[PDB]
Design a protein around this ligand. Structure first.
Ligand SMILES: CCCCCCCCCCCCCC(=O)O
Lengths: 33, 213, 208, 35
């Protein structure tokens, strides 16, 4: 529902889960090109 | 290892799009596009440790760890997408999927939309094959995106900064699980993670094999 | 359990858990629904349950008004929670006298608000002069697994019924091409007694 | 997630003591008796 989209944006924008940048991914993961 | 495929099942297409009519002229904006054309011009796939993405997908019974451990492990892929959101906004939001199977299965395609690793909506389609050039092909063409997705995309474009769009997409994932009805075996499983493409670029992606080293 | 209209019927709806102990499978049924001869069903005024389901556009009231009104049902379930809590799932079977494409939407509601949704599409197979739709071993969402484990671990049995007071499931079966409502089942729950299996009652919903 | 299930349980149980009950609504007697 619309309310669930809004719930997601509130939690995500509220700046217990490591950021993706702090996890082990190869350098291609951060390069769109 | 060069494509989202096993020895007996492959992804032929996955396209997320929106159709826009303006001044009696139709055009289709591609948010995400994965092809499946198989040739020597395809680089070998990099690998990603699946333990790094467990908290972004459903857990417990039937979750990603359980499905991966049940296997086959070579059916598991992670796609990192740069969704193209460089579009103004009557519009139709759709998805087109296409698959090829060596065996004539009844293909059960489950798609789970997740927010902070939790399912919001799961769409399950149980498709039958069509013989196209002696191949079993399955197509779910211009299938409507659910209202949640439409609202999500519309709200992402309201963000004044691209860093806010990326923080919001960091916890937005989609999990695709393709199964054969008769055996209930996993034929293919694709996890999707997202970032927003640059304003001067269209959609791009990288495909990774999920390993548990 | 014959939940049937002039054209569509639910033949089976089984929510269950499966465990493999010593290389042998064991199944426990939480809920089980499912003859051409039955007594008349009891009726229930749909207005008594509106507040337990979403009330916006496309909600239970809007769906009932659009009809057909012979397709609305209320199922009262006594869920069997007596088991040692691996797969959690639902197996269901449906029958039609017309080969439409079935689209089954199931929503889980907490205090009349949608928490999670599942939309499943199925094609029929003609079998013994009826079209059959099967949805075998559909995996339960994590929310429901979490909900069931938390419910059975409540320290007092009355608490299980208090938590179920505002927990509902709404199923809307539709024919894909026409969007016709084939069947709509509203589900409400209580926990079965310790020494008992799962039981249920079925009510026709009417605008009383 | 566990937190979403927890929010429903917390609101329903109301441990800290922070609409008609189903028991007082118009349902046939069979609605309250499993048998
Ligand atoms: C909470 C105890 C009573 C309810 C237990 C059985 C409910 C029926 C199955 C619900 C499945 C919803 C859809 C899904 O999770 O995929």
């Amino acid at each position: 529902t619309a309310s669930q989209v809004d719930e997601h944006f509130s939690r995500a924008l509220n700046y217990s889960s490591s950021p993706m940048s702090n996890r082990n991914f190869p350098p291609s993961f951060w390069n769109s090109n | 290892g060069r494509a989202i495929a096993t020895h007996k099942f492959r992804l032929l297409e996955f396209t997320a799009f929106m159709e826009i009519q303006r001044d009696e002229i139709y055009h289709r904006h591609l948010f995400v596009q994965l092809g499946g054309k198989p040739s020597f011009s395809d680089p070998l796939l990099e690998t990603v440790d699946i333990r790094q993405i467990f908290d972004k997908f459903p857990e417990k019974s039937g979750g990603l760890k359980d499905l991966y451990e049940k296997g086959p492990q070579n059916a598991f892929y992670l796609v990192k997408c740069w969704a193209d959101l460089n579009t103004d906004l009557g519009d139709f939001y759709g998805v087109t999927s296409q698959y090829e199977s060596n065996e004539n299965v009844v293909l059960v395609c489950s798609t789970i939309v997740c927010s902070f690793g939790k399912q919001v909506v799961e769409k399950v389609e149980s498709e039958y094959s069509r013989l196209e050039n002696n191949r079993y092909v399955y197509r779910i063409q211009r299938s409507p995106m659910c209202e949640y997705m439409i609202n999500f995309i519309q709200k992402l474009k309201n963000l004044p900064e691209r860093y806010m769009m990326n923080s919001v997409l960091e916890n937005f994932t989609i999990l695709q699980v393709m199964r054969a009805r008769e055996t209930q075996e996993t034929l293919l499983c694709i996890a999707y993670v997202f970032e927003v493409a640059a304003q001067n670029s269209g959609t791009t992606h990288h495909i990774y094999r999920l390993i548990k080293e």
